[PDB]
RNA sequence: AGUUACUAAGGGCUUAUGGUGGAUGCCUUGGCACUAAUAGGCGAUGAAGGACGUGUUAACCUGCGAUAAGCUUC
RNA sequence: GUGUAGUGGCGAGCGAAAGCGGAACAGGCCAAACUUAUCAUUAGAUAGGGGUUGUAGGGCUUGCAAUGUGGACUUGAAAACGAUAGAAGAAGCUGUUGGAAAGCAGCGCGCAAAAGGGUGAUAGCCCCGUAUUUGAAAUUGUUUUCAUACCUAGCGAGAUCCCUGAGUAGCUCGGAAAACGUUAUUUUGAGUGAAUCUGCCCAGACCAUUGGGUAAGCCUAAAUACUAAUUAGUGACCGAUAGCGAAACAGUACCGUGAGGGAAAGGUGAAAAGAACCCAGAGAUGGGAGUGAAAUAGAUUCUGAAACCAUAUGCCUACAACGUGUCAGAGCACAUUAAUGUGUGAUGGCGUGCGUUUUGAAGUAUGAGCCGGCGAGUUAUGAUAGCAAGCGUUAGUUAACCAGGAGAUGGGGAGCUGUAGCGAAAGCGAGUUUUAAAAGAGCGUUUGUUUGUUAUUAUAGACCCGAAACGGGUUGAGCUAGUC
RNA sequence: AGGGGUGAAAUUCCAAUCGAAAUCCGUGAUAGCUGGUUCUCGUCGAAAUAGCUUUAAGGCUAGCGUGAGAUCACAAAUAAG
RNA sequence: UUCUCGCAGUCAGACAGUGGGGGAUAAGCUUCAUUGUCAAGAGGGGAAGAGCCCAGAUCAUUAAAUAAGGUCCCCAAAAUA
RNA sequence: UUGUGGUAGACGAGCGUUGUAUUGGAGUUGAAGUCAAAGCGUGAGCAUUGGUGGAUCCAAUACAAGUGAGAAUGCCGGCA
RNA sequence: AAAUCCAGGUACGGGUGAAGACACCCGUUAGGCGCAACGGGACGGAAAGACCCCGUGAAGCUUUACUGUAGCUUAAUAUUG
RNA sequence: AAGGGUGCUUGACUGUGAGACAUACAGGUCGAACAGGUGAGAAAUCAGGUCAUAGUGAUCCGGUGGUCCAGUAUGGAAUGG
């Protein structure tokens, strides 16, 4: 395309802009889509979100959830899942190898966890802080191995 | 970018003014009254097209009715005879015949009068 | 936009976007309800479709 | 006896012209928002801001201060 | 990081501190010990040496190694880069329309100069300039070099002695600061009040263990905030109702006792060559003449719209019930964006305006005297949904910042979304919560991300106009009320 | 000298204004209440109902409209039994 | 006309027939259920009329057949017994 | 073949103004503006000629908006 | 000059209609245009009704309405033997 | 019979719950069937309060009992779940 003839893909650039003040021929004149003389037709707006006209809102009607660990943050974990790790190409899965594969950031010290049930064909040698009993069963059903770092 | 209105309002206003040419005083001078008169005149024109279609039929019926009463026949029976004889002619052309061609109009009335239906 | 502090602490989300909630009438006046009513109100629920739209933009 | 035009004191319509008026169009020793640098003060050695006065020159504006529309030096 | 932990009549709302990525980076100095000299040395005071801390430091006594490196630092000398005036600075003629050439056409030329302004129209080569090369007697700014003051220096041994900031830290009673509506931490109006490196404070009440740090003394460049002003320049900014209220002599005229409020108004022509002279008139002025391309460009000075006021060709109108038009329709008068043409309309049929708000308006409801200009859905930051494009299954994409034209962009992977869910949570994991249960039931056992456009929405004044009001500051007792 | 003054007292007077001056500022106060909101064509096209509401001239959800997608029959309409 | 998603407007209704409540078998009254119209709908009949009857306007035609209603004149159209 | 009354409202397709970027073109042998006329379009709208006017303007494809006036006892100016 | 003014070429009777018509339906009357008068109508003009109601409006005032507070009073504590 | 009397008892249970009624939401109503351990009865069977429909109040806040959860460096505690 030249600079004197440049075109967008159809139905990508231009869409029908709803002009609210330019005449009745567009169907959006005078009132401009607000309705007629009520609260929603003034400049203020649409009240508050969640309001119910004075009736107790839904959130104010329902009991509050409880936070057992008040003031704490859940310990984040980096999880290696067995259904997808097969797609990744590597053997002897340790922290350093994941760093080279850039699954984990080198500036992170989160403990590695092993999760999954899906059967894997080739054997892998994991170095994981935590592993499920049946995930370990699947891994050791093949000729792989898992060592639990402490 | 301050777009300024000029030649846009005046052109569309002068169109309405041009349409309302020949009106009484301010009805052709001021744009507002001119616009109202054109809309009202358009409504009148629309309604009178329909009313013209009906009024000219009535006038043809009246002329045809008169042309028949001079010969002793009535409109109500003339059309019935026309239908039974299968003759299909507008009252417009029939009235035009009775005003322009008295002899041939009299020929049509003579055939519808007595000749065997079909 | 700020998430409403009352919308949270009362509405937890799920995998498919459903908004979990707790049943009301479970704070006091226990003898005025039957054990069937109490054990049915103990379980949690989800907001109805009439409120799903209003809670989605609230969270 | 019957059917009849001319009237225009004045008014209406179309078109053309003249007058009041400054809309539209073009322009601007003027404004606005910033960029890159400089600088971020003046004053008892009299400040900022004013009054008065000064011409071969009516008033106003600007400059100037009894050395008064300018004085000396580089 | 996140609108996260939290804080909120747990309502409206408010909202960090760690960590990570960047811009810049710098650490110094007193009091006390100890010692010197002097003060009727009652010093408990003055002036010096010594010292500045946490993997504790310093002083006391005793040795080795040192003559340096660096400053937030004083005076000078020299040099460089600038600022406040400037100098030089290339290249065209002919013909045509035209009042006028620079336009147009022919043939050329210069360029580190084709930014711009003027010149009788629209000029690279007519002029001033611009690119580029340069230049300061005098004042002033930045940097560098040399010298010169001031400050600035390591590692041991022994002694077991001394010093390390008091109405201070804590505590109680009322407040506050931090995101916190008072509470671990910080601060203070009243009261009380400690200890001295085996010491004191801190790690969200508090105690013990562990660890971190040295309060009650001071100074500290850089990155950061802003533009009244000076120089250069830019604008998908405005172009006399716009842009500053103010293009003009605008905070003026004017209004008010005062504080205070506050306008309108630009354009002759290339050049005044601004109309000598004649006629009418008292004169202004007008009509000729003259200049000029144009005087219907004449100082009333670019163009000159509508409402409004007058003149006239043509048609109609003085027995006529009219939202004034429409459909038919004679006669009259003309001839065009050549079209079953145009102007008027004797007469016949039909016919109670436009917006607003209402169940319902011709309305005895409302708003507009007419004309012209101005006048009301936007922007910034986020969320959802539709459409489309880029990249894709260990995906996708950068924010700040740096370089680059006030650029596209490159670097920057800090982070954000998705990849595994369930549970209040520890926790488990294609499972998980409930439960004695594996039974039953709830939720899951998959379909992504970054942009562009549109629609809606949240915070902001949020489509525009309109209150009576409230709070804070100033000006008024020249009118009037009281008193002297 | 103004949440003040003065008042032989009437809500008098305080610069033609006084149930509490004038002016500037917060300020573009707020208004569920009036008024206004500017070009065109085509397709489709409502409601004035229920519950709650310090709610009754307002608001939320449901009912009725519109755009996109799915469901082909077992879904939904019109007649007969 | 069922299900899912985006965007709404509506919460003042009116009259006519039919079955009732309140009123007095009064109201162009008020409150309900149901069938229609108007609201948001012109045309023809009703002399004139938002809601009654006939019906549903894409534009042009000086074409034809009809619905409610009507045929002495206004005003289109009739005659017999 | 079935359709095309319509307010609130939903959806789709377009016109017009100013400027910018790429192309091309017109203009003192007369551009914009401005007036008149017996033209062309389904609609916003678009041309042709002549008078006045004296220097800029037009067409196409995209982009950005202070982008469309008949009403607000709307503001300003003029005139009834 | 002035308020006023949607454009007007602006009759009466009965009826109708948003329920009291210069403009609608049916009839009657009326040559075009002034001047001097007087006020019947144009629900005439001037004042976004002061009466009534509505607004989760304002302001002034009152009290054993609520929450506070200036001032007054009592005690502890410091100055304080 | 769902009314009256007698004997034995406490199902006036624990964890649940396919499917429906009615509903804007929040809530309400009926309930087969499963596991545990019981009561009556020889057994079949019945019992998750009464012949049925009124006898009831959300959220926030704080208190009480239990508890296989948290415990702001660690062990507790405080304070929460
Ligand atoms: Mg519409
Ligand atoms: Mg809308
Ligand atoms: Mg309403
Ligand atoms: Mg309105
Ligand atoms: Mg509304
Ligand atoms: Mg309430
Ligand atoms: Mg305009
Ligand atoms: Mg005459
Ligand atoms: Mg005349
Ligand atoms: Mg020179
Ligand atoms: Mg030169
Ligand atoms: Mg030039
Ligand atoms: Mg402490
Ligand atoms: Mg605070
Ligand atoms: Mg220590
Ligand atoms: Mg702790
Ligand atoms: Mg210390
Ligand atoms: Mg101005
Ligand atoms: Mg002006
Ligand atoms: Mg004065
Ligand atoms: Mg002259
Ligand atoms: Mg003039
Ligand atoms: Mg002029
Ligand atoms: Mg006559
Ligand atoms: Mg007569
Ligand atoms: Mg009449
Ligand atoms: Mg007539
Ligand atoms: Mg007529
Ligand atoms: Mg009429
Ligand atoms: Mg309008
Ligand atoms: Mg009304
Ligand atoms: Mg009414
Ligand atoms: Mg009237
Ligand atoms: Mg009235
Ligand atoms: Mg009104
Ligand atoms: Mg009026
Ligand atoms: Mg106007
Ligand atoms: Mg999107
Ligand atoms: Mg980048
Ligand atoms: Mg399961
Ligand atoms: Mg994609
Ligand atoms: Mg006095
Ligand atoms: Mg007050
Ligand atoms: Mg009184
Ligand atoms: Mg007075
Ligand atoms: Mg306002
Ligand atoms: Mg209010
Ligand atoms: Mg339709
Ligand atoms: Mg209805
Ligand atoms: Mg109903
Ligand atoms: Mg209301
Ligand atoms: Mg709704
Ligand atoms: Mg009703
Ligand atoms: Mg009702
Ligand atoms: Mg009825
Ligand atoms: Mg009744
Ligand atoms: Mg009744
Ligand atoms: Mg009624
Ligand atoms: Mg309505
Ligand atoms: Mg009708
Ligand atoms: Mg009729
Ligand atoms: Mg139709
Ligand atoms: Mg027929
Ligand atoms: Mg018939
Ligand atoms: Mg007849
Ligand atoms: Mg339609
Ligand atoms: Mg353009
Ligand atoms: Mg022209
Ligand atoms: Mg505008
Ligand atoms: Mg009546
Ligand atoms: Mg009123
Ligand atoms: Mg109140
Ligand atoms: Mg209030
Ligand atoms: Mg005391
Ligand atoms: Mg018994
Ligand atoms: Mg019993
Ligand atoms: Mg409470
Ligand atoms: Mg602990």
């Amino acid at each position: 395309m030249e600079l004197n003839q440049l075109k967008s893909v159809p139905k990508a650039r231009n869409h029908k802009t709803k002009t609210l003040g330019r005449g009745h021929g567009s169907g959006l004149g005078k009132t401009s889509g607000r309705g007629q003389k009520g609260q929603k037709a003034r400049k203020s707006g649409l009240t508050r979100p969640g309001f119910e006209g004075g009736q107790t809102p839904l959130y104010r009607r329902l009991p509050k959830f409880g936070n057992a660990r008040k003031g704490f943050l859940k310990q984040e974990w980096v999880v290696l899942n067995l259904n997808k790790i097969a797609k990744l190409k590597l053997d002897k899965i340790n922290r350093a190898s994941l760093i080279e594969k850039q699954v984990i950031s080198a500036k992170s010290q989160l403990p590695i966890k092993l999760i999954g049930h899906t059967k894997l064909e080739k054997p892998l040698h994991f170095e994981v802080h935590k592993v499920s009993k049946q995930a370990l069963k699947a891994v050791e059903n093949a000729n792989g191995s898992v060592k639990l770092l402490e | 970018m301050r777009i300024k209105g000029g030649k846009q309002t005046r052109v569309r206003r002068k169109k309405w003014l041009k349409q309302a040419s020949g009106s009484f005083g301010t009805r052709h001078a001021s744009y507002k009254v001119a616009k109202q008169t054109v809309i009202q005149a358009a409504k009148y024109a629309y309604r009178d097209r329909r009313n013209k279609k009906r009024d000219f039929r009535s006038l043809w019926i009246l002329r045809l009715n008169a042309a028949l009463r001079e010969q002793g026949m009535t409109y109500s029976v003339f059309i019935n005879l026309l239908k039974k004889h299968n003759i299909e002619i507008n009252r417009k052309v029939l009235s035009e015949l009775a005003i322009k061609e008295p002899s041939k109009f009299n020929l049509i009335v003579q055939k519808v009068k007595s000749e065997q239906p079909k | 936009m700020k998430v409403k502090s009352a919308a949270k602490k009362r509405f937890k989300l799920t995998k498919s976007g459903q908004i979990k909630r707790k049943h009301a009438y479970t704070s006091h006046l226990a003898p005025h309800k039957t054990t069937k009513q109490k054990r049915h109100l103990r379980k949690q629920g989800t907001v109805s479709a009439s409120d799903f739209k209003r809670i989605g933009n609230l969270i």
Side-chain angles (χ1 to χ4, degrees), chain B residues 24-41:
Chain B
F24 201 90
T26 310
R27 299 211 159 199
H28 70 245
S30 79
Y31 153 76
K32 306 173 170 193
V33 185
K35 180 176 172 187
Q36 299 173 183
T37 55
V38 170
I39 298 165
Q40 186 74 270

Side-chain angles (χ1 to χ4, degrees), chain A residues 77-90 93 98 103 111-120 124 126 128 130-132 134-136 138-139, chain C residues 15:
Chain A
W77 278 78
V78 43
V79 174
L80 311 186
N81 211 258
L82 278 199
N83 55 43
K84 218 154 162 204
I85 191 144
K87 287 209 276 190
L88 169 149
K89 141 158 186 93
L90 197 39
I93 290 130
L98 298 180
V103 179
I112 298 271
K113 165 157 246 303
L114 198 57
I115 285 305
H117 167 26
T118 282
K119 175 254 287 186
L120 66 183
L124 312 175
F126 290 92
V128 279
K130 269 207 154 315
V131 48
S132 305
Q134 99 157 72
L136 172 69
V139 151
Chain C
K15 169 72 155 191

Side-chain angles (χ1 to χ4, degrees), chain A residues 69 73-79 108-113:
Chain A
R69 279 208 106 186
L73 261 292
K74 224 200 172 283
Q75 165 41 312
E76 241 198 323
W77 278 78
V78 43
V79 174
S108 110
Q109 283 264 314
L110 302 116
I112 298 271
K113 165 157 246 303

Side-chain angles (χ1 to χ4, degrees), chain B residues 62-96:
Chain B
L62 172 52
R63 285 189 186 169
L64 210 85
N65 198 6
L68 276 287
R69 310 220 96 149
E70 270 66 349
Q71 270 147 41
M73 166 135 82
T74 54
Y75 187 80
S76 326
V77 312
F78 181 59
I79 281 196
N80 195 36
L81 292 176
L82 272 178
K83 197 180 33 139
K84 308 265 214 71
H85 279 225
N86 299 18
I87 323 191
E88 278 202 43
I89 292 169
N90 294 356
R91 305 113 171 84
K92 147 176 215 154
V93 188
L94 263 166
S95 182
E96 278 164 323

